Amino acid sequence: MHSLLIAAILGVVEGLTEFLPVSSTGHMIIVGHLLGFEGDTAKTFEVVIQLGSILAVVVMFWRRLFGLIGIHFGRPLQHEGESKGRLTLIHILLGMIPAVVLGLLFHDTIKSLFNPINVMYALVVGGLLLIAAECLKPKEPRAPGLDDMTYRQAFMIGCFQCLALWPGFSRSGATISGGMLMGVSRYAASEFSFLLAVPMMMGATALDLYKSWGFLTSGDIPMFAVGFITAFVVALIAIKTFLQLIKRISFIPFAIYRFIVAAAVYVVFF
Ligand SMILES: CCCCCCCC/C=C\CCCCCCCC(=O)OC[C@H](O)CO
Ligand SMILES: [Hg+2]
Ligand SMILES: [Hg+2]
Fold it and tell me: Which of 81, 157, 129 is nearest to 255 (CA)?
């Protein structure tokens, strides 16, 4: 059946691109256009399968995410860093504040930038930001591990997450670029952007799910569930592959890939 085959295709697109710095939103508007699923019911479908990819990080960093809110499961949490420091809830809070303040204050304006021409620009500009972060980052990272991050690095990454409010800019692209520019290693900057995505997008979709709750019906549960679960599986493969891939590879290929995706946005929509 078409409805669930499409739900499985959008699921694998969301699972791969949500946490890769390649703009899940950008890929979603392309494939959604080629599939024909572009109505108000699509925007509500694409926000619930985001919660599927959310749950992937949640599963992958289960013990870590709970330790930040005070729940330690009777075993020492595993240390990722060269110092005696530990990533705290304050690190997450600082990484959220700037984009939250700007997101709330400019909600109506942010929503008016969801054009395909804006997503195209955010794919190119966000790609250029990845290149600048790769070319400007220090030789020796100040925070090689996640637990080596400072309150200042966390806050500066948080300010960089405002760029993610630009539709098509890829929250992971913005936050990982800012991490590398603040002396955070690619691995820890990717880890921190995933962890930051959990409170950001769970509050983001909960926000979207409330304002768009009216569209949900009894018939959406089969489609909305097949995509949710698909985005969960694919993201768990994507995040685990990415974190091992980025240990050896740079972000240059992802930037160039974003330029190719920008070309597709123009071919498909203009
Ligand atoms: C759903 C739409 C499709 C999703 C688009 C995904 C984005 C990936 C694009 C560019 C990254 C290219 C880098 C990944 C390729 C690396 C493969 C590889 O083998 O490189 C490893 C290297 O050998 C180390 O030792
Ligand atoms: Hg350079
Ligand atoms: Hg900011």
Answer: 129
Q: What's the CA-to-centroid distance between 222 and ligand 3, angstroms?
A: 39
- Ligand 1 centroid to 241 CA: how many Å? 10
Structure-determination approach: X-ray
Q: Which residues approach ligand 1 with their CB closer than 6 A?
A: 13, 16-17, 20, 22, 27, 245, 248-249, 253-254, 257
